[PDB]
Ligand binder design. Structure first.
Ligand SMILES: CC(C)CCn1nc(N2CCCC2)c(O)c(C2=Nc3ccc(NS(C)(=O)=O)cc3S(=O)(=O)N2)c1=O
Length: 557
């Protein structure tokens, strides 16, 4: 069937949309080539609709069914609980889209009566009706990039009432099931450091390692009714309350399999027969489906000593090489199998024999050196999108602060330390907003973070090593330098100069601010300070951070 059917009604915005980078008094200090930076808007949604609309064929063989049986046997060991209305409510982000039925996210969060009462009626309807398709809104994402222009991604999501109900039925399931079914292959269980560790140990575990990333073309669109029903049958293996079983059956039939699409004006835009990108099960559903298909394709291609790492639609495989000719042949067969299962590639995969050249989840393993001179592996990425977004964020308040997310996830990196930390601490100092909590997104879920906790956060996730790294790789240094030339970002020596100032200003404030100065900016001084563990570091509850992925899942932790 077709992934989408369209009526011709447009995908429409809620408010005016900016596509050009906003400029303020701070912009030039970060980036001179403003025309290189853009945001996607609904006005390009038609281009996206074109790309994501196609027929899906699916041919399922014994490998597919063998792997599904295995996954189901592991899923049968999972026991999951229903969430209360109140529990689900507290998982709703403050900025989440309002209901059509007369309440908003903040009415949900402080548990207003009107909100709770509608949520109860949505649940009851789900229990009582397992056939009536549930309304969804289709919107165009506003995301920031550097010109290479990408059309807007689409988001499809049900009403706030339903979203709360999804959490009630499925939050526990999607939080716990994937690691049990997929074990070490489940990507969202890892911090950046742990992900590095897994990749490195896996690479070393092979006599002659070969790895490839596999890019499915428009993964959500390739997901069929079959796939979504199969994913439900996996959830149904769990030990669940009777109401949970019913609600999951109902959500699958009425929501997950497909449904009508409504624009922000209330017009029927058409019909969806593929993955909704804005439902609770998007991440878990995609991960299970990617893993199921990839696992079976590995068996089809007879890949030797395969190890998969799967993060929703993002897939990387490390295996034993058979030489370049046989590896190329193997991947072609792997790709043929994936194609038959309805996951054909965007870029065809290519075997890689250098771990540092494998990009997976937009990132790669690289190497630098700690204080002792000892080599330390860490996760990095091309800093172009991070810097484009940081520039947008310099002039505009956004619901999600990608700069803060990038500092957390990419703290050991040359570009996050020298540029992101320096820039945004300067901004926070000037406004005296060091103490103000900011929202960021990690593995799809929204976190309120106090910037002053950064040193504790980085110590816990990455270790004190992250404040001491030096002698980065020629490839990494060149990629950063190239990026700065592209965007017209000041050379790394200007940032060192600015960092000395930011460090000194922070030290003058004493307290947590001084702690930021000492740890975050020790790289900036010729004669360093001795960095020892931070006392308060244990107090922070980082449980829940790297357990599961929740993209489009409307989660607040
Ligand atoms: C250590 C890490 C692997 C480095 C790269 N990195 N960095 C992230 N962050 C850096 C600062 C902002 C968040 C981040 O959250 C993700 C991330 N991975 C995903 C991959 C694939 C899908 N596909 S889907 C729609 O769920 O089917 C979704 C997600 S996500 O939305 O849960 N977020 C990430 O991969």
């Amino acid at each position: 069937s077709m992934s989408y059917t369209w009526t011709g009604a447009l995908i429409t915005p809620c408010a005016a949309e900016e596509s050009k980078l906003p400029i303020n008094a701070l912009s030039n200090s970060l980036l001179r080539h403003h025309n290189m930076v853009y945001a996607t808007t609904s006005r390009s949604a038609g281009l996206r609709q074109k790309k994501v609309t196609f027929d899906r064929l699916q041919v399922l063989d014994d490998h597919y069914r063998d792997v599904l049986k295995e996954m189901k046997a592991k899923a049968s060991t999972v026991k999951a609980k229903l969430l209360s209305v109140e529990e689900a409510c507290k998982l709703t982000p403050p900025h989440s889209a309002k209901s059509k039925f007369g309440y908003g996210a903040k009415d949900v969060r402080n548990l207003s009566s009107k909100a709770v009462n509608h949520i109860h009626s949505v649940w009851k309807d789900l229990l009582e009706d397992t056939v009536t398709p549930i309304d969804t809104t289709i919107m165009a994402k506003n995301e920031v990039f550097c010109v290479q222009r990408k059309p807007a991604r689409l988001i499809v999501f049900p009403d706030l009432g339903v979203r709360v109900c999804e959490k009630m039925a499925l939050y526990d399931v999607v939080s716990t099931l994937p690691q049990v079914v997929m074990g070490s292959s489940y990507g969202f269980q890892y911090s950046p450091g742990q992900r590095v560790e897994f990749l490195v140990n896996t690479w070393k575990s092979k006599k002659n390692p070969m790895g490839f990333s596999y890019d499915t073309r428009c993964f959500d669109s390739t997901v069929t009714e079959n796939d979504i029903r199969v994913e439900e049958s996996i959830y149904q293996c769990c030990d669940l309350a009777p109401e949970a079983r019913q609600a999951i059956k109902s959500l699958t039939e009425r929501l997950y399999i497909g449904g009508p699409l409504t624009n922000s004006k209330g017009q029927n835009c058409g019909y969806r027969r593929c993955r909704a990108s804005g439902v609770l099960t998007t991440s878990c559903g995609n991960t299970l489906t990617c893993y199921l298909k990839a696992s079976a394709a590995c068996r089809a291609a007879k890949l030797q000593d395969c190890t998969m790492l799967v993060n929703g639609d993002d897939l990387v495989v490390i295996c034993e090489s058979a030489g370049t000719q046989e590896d190329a042949a193997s991947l072609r067969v792997f790709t043929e199998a994936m194609t038959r299962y309805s996951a054909p590639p965007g870029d065809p995969p290519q075997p890689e024999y250098d771990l540092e050249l494998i990009t997976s989840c937009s990132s790669n393993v690289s190497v630098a050196h700690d204080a002792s001179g000892k080599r330390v592996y860490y996760l990095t990425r091309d800093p172009t999108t991070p810097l484009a977004r940081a520039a947008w964020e310099t002039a505009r308040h956004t619901p999600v602060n990608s700069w803060l997310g990038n500092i957390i996830m990419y703290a050991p990196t040359l570009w996050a330390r020298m540029i992101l930390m320096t820039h945004f601490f300067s901004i926070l100092l000037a406004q005296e907003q060091l103490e103000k909590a900011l929202d960021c997104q990690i593995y799809g879920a929204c976190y309120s973070i106090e910037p002053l906790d950064l040193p504790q956060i980085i110590e816990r996730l990455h270790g004190l090593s992250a404040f001491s790294l030096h002698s980065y790789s020629p490839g990494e240094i060149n990629r950063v330098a190239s990026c700065l030339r592209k965007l017209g970002v000041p050379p790394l020596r200007v940032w060192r100069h600015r960092a000395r100032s930011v460090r000194a200003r922070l030290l003058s404030q004493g307290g947590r601010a001084a702690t930021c100065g000492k740890y975050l900016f020790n790289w900036a001084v010729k004669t360093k300070l001795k960095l020892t563990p931070i006392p308060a570091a244990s107090q922070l509850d980082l449980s829940g951070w790297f357990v599961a992925g929740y993209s489009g899942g409307d989660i607040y932790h």
